[PDB]
Motif scaffolding. Structure first.
Motif, PDB file in Angstrom:
ATOM      1  N   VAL A  23       0.839  -1.189   0.000  1.00 18.34           N
ATOM      2  CA  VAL A  23       0.000   0.000   0.000  1.00 18.34           C
ATOM      3  C   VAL A  23       0.879   1.246   0.000  1.00 18.34           C
ATOM      4  O   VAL A  23       0.434   2.318  -0.401  1.00 18.34           O
ATOM      5  CB  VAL A  23      -1.019   0.021   1.179  1.00 18.34           C
ATOM      6  N   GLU A  24       2.132   1.102   0.426  1.00 18.47           N
ATOM      7  CA  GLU A  24       3.088   2.192   0.303  1.00 18.47           C
ATOM      8  C   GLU A  24       3.285   2.559  -1.154  1.00 18.47           C
ATOM      9  O   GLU A  24       3.395   3.721  -1.495  1.00 18.47           O
ATOM     10  CB  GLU A  24       4.441   1.836   0.943  1.00 18.47           C
ATOM     11  N   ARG A  25       3.341   1.556  -2.014  1.00 19.34           N
ATOM     12  CA  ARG A  25       3.555   1.781  -3.428  1.00 19.34           C
ATOM     13  C   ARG A  25       2.392   2.509  -4.086  1.00 19.34           C
ATOM     14  O   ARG A  25       2.587   3.264  -5.031  1.00 19.34           O
ATOM     15  CB  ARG A  25       3.759   0.442  -4.121  1.00 19.34           C
ATOM     16  N   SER A  26       1.200   2.345  -3.529  1.00 24.05           N
ATOM     17  CA  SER A  26      -0.014   2.940  -4.094  1.00 24.05           C
ATOM     18  C   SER A  26      -0.301   4.341  -3.589  1.00 24.05           C
ATOM     19  O   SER A  26      -1.381   4.875  -3.817  1.00 24.05           O
ATOM     20  CB  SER A  26      -1.217   2.056  -3.787  1.00 24.05           C
ATOM     21  N   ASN A  42      -4.964  -1.850   8.706  1.00 20.92           N
ATOM     22  CA  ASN A  42      -4.461  -0.726   9.485  1.00 20.92           C
ATOM     23  C   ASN A  42      -4.385   0.619   8.788  1.00 20.92           C
ATOM     24  O   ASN A  42      -4.970   0.855   7.736  1.00 20.92           O
ATOM     25  CB  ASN A  42      -3.072  -1.035  10.045  1.00 20.92           C
ATOM     26  N   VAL A  43      -3.627   1.497   9.429  1.00 29.43           N
ATOM     27  CA  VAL A  43      -3.496   2.873   9.049  1.00 29.43           C
ATOM     28  C   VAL A  43      -2.034   3.278   9.002  1.00 29.43           C
ATOM     29  O   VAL A  43      -1.296   3.144   9.986  1.00 29.43           O
ATOM     30  CB  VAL A  43      -4.228   3.759  10.044  1.00 29.43           C
ATOM     31  N   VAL A  44      -1.629   3.790   7.845  1.00 31.14           N
ATOM     32  CA  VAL A  44      -0.273   4.262   7.633  1.00 31.14           C
ATOM     33  C   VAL A  44      -0.305   5.772   7.427  1.00 31.14           C
ATOM     34  O   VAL A  44      -1.273   6.320   6.895  1.00 31.14           O
ATOM     35  CB  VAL A  44       0.385   3.554   6.433  1.00 31.14           C
ATOM     36  N   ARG A  45       0.738   6.443   7.898  1.00 29.91           N
ATOM     37  CA  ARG A  45       0.878   7.884   7.731  1.00 29.91           C
ATOM     38  C   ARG A  45       2.226   8.266   7.100  1.00 29.91           C
ATOM     39  O   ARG A  45       3.183   7.492   7.124  1.00 29.91           O
ATOM     40  CB  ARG A  45       0.680   8.589   9.076  1.00 29.91           C
ATOM     41  N   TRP A  46       2.263   9.430   6.466  1.00 31.71           N
ATOM     42  CA  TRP A  46       3.457   9.897   5.779  1.00 31.71           C
ATOM     43  C   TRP A  46       3.871  11.241   6.344  1.00 31.71           C
ATOM     44  O   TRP A  46       3.108  12.193   6.346  1.00 31.71           O
ATOM     45  CB  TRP A  46       3.198   9.995   4.272  1.00 31.71           C
ATOM     46  N   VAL A  47       5.093  11.300   6.835  1.00 36.84           N
ATOM     47  CA  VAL A  47       5.623  12.507   7.430  1.00 36.84           C
ATOM     48  C   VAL A  47       6.684  13.109   6.515  1.00 36.84           C
ATOM     49  O   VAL A  47       7.526  12.377   5.991  1.00 36.84           O
ATOM     50  CB  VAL A  47       6.222  12.226   8.808  1.00 36.84           C
ATOM     51  N   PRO A  48       6.615  14.432   6.282  1.00 37.09           N
ATOM     52  CA  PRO A  48       7.615  15.200   5.540  1.00 37.09           C
ATOM     53  C   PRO A  48       8.942  15.211   6.291  1.00 37.09           C
ATOM     54  O   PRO A  48       8.934  15.134   7.519  1.00 37.09           O
ATOM     55  CB  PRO A  48       7.008  16.593   5.472  1.00 37.09           C
TER      56      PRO A  48
END
Length: 190
Positions: A23-26, A42-48
């Motif tokens: 799901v990271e790839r998407s 689950n739930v993934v988040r992306w931090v700058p």
């Protein structure tokens, strides 16, 4: 996916999306200078990586869906255990170095790099609600005013303070509440 559409947030705001590599790839973060960051679960988040650029349009692509938000001013707060301060800067210049109570020597404010999660004008905090009696030294029953949620785990910006929370005077807590917006960086360091 959060933030919502059009939402104007601060610069520490991560994007939250509800095989780990698959799901990271998407998902991909599209910015004017192709800002880099990383995934955190689950739930993934992306931090700058060093935050968002101020006043920048961000769009999030997740599968066949795209959504986008805005960043506003770069308003940064820094909490020092040792200096006993909460210092709020906005775009380089500091606006206020404010005296702060950062937890208690038994449970001081946890070191980390966070963001303002929410704003609540008053909030009642009962230790009985999470299993802690009132006859304990780490027990409480109070109404917090101008409360800014720092962590999921219960730190609030709103002195023998429990739960690691950050306590300010009403004048300073009111201002920060006025000054702050969802997303702004809150930094807990030395």
């Amino acid at each position: 996916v959060s933030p919502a559409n059009g939402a104007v947030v601060g610069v520490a705001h991560p994007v939250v999306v509800t095989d780990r590599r698959a799901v990271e790839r998407s998902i991909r973060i599209s910015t004017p200078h192709n800002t880099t960051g990383h995934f955190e679960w689950n739930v993934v988040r992306w931090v700058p990586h060093r935050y968002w650029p101020p006043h920048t349009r961000v769009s999030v692509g997740v599968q066949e869906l795209t959504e986008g938000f805005e960043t506003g001013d770069a308003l940064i707060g820094v909490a020092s255990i040792s200096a006993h301060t909460f210092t709020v800067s906005r775009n380089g210049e500091v606006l206020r170095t404010m005296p702060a109570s950062l937890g208690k020597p038994s449970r001081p404010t946890p070191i980390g790099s966070f963001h303002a999660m929410s704003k609540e004008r008053t909030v009642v905090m009962d230790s009985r609600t999470i299993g802690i009696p009132l006859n304990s030294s780490d027990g409480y029953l109070l109404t917090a005013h101008y409360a800014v949620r720092v962590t999921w785990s219960g730190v609030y910006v709103h002195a023998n303070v429990s739960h690691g929370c950050i306590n300010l005077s009403p004048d300073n807590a009111a201002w920060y509440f006025d000054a702050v917006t969802v997303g702004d960086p809150i930094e807990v360091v030395g």
